[PDB]
């Protein structure tokens, strides 16, 4: 299911660089365990920047 | 998300044993929440001490306290435990318990989002 929420991220990575930012990655969490405010904060901790590295997201916060 | 405050703090004789408490108000159910401690020690960098998945099934120590405290949680009470034992000079820091959103074990800082505030261990004669 993580595993999963990977092939989401990439479904929505229209020209497959790896980023999305913190804003799509909201959009689909909520299309999918965590409480909105989790979302929030956990892509806030993962980094400051607004593109996300969404492999690597997954790998350290919910992996 | 989870608000979380550790309490036992103090000062402990070489060779003694002292319990950490940390208590967590989760939004959702606690067992969804892996936990850890860990520790930071003077204009040192913040290290893992010791991890437990969210149903507290699983524990996992740094090499260097394994084999003398134990980490524990009880998800009735919404809290988590550390039990020092044999302490060492090493082991004086503030201590912190920090949970991930998932209920998977982590090693690293990287993995957790919530942090408590900090509590001072001092190890001395």
């Known amino acids: 299911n993580v595993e999963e929420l990977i092939k989401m991220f990439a479904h929505f990575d229209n020209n497959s660089t790896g980023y999305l930012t913190k804003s799509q990655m909201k959009n689909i969490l909520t299309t999918w365990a965590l409480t909105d405010q989790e979302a929030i904060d956990a892509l806030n901790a993962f980094s400051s920047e607004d593109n996300i590295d969404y492999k690597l997201f997954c790998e350290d916060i919910l992996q | 998300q989870v608000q979380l405050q550790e309490s036992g703090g103090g000062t402990v004789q070489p060779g003694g044993s002292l319990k950490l408490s940390c208590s967590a108000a989760?939004?959702?159910?606690?067992?969804?929440?892996?936990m850890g401690w860990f520790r930071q020690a003077p204009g040192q960098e913040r290290e893992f001490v010791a991890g437990?998945?969210?149903?507290?099934?699983?524990?996992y120590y740094a090499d260097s306290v394994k084999g003398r405290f134990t980490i524990s949680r009880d998800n009735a009470m919404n809290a988590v435990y550390l039990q020092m034992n044999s302490v060492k000079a090493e082991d004086t820091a503030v201590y912190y318990c920090?949970?991930?959103?998932?209920?998977?074990?982590?090693?690293?800082?990287?993995?957790?989002?919530?942090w408590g505030q900090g509590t001072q261990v001092t190890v001395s004669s």
């Open positions: 920090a949970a991930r959103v998932v209920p998977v074990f982590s090693d690293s800082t990287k993995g957790y989002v919530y």
């Open positions: 989760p939004e959702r159910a606690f067992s969804n929440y892996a």
């Open positions: 437990i998945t969210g149903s507290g099934r699983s524990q």
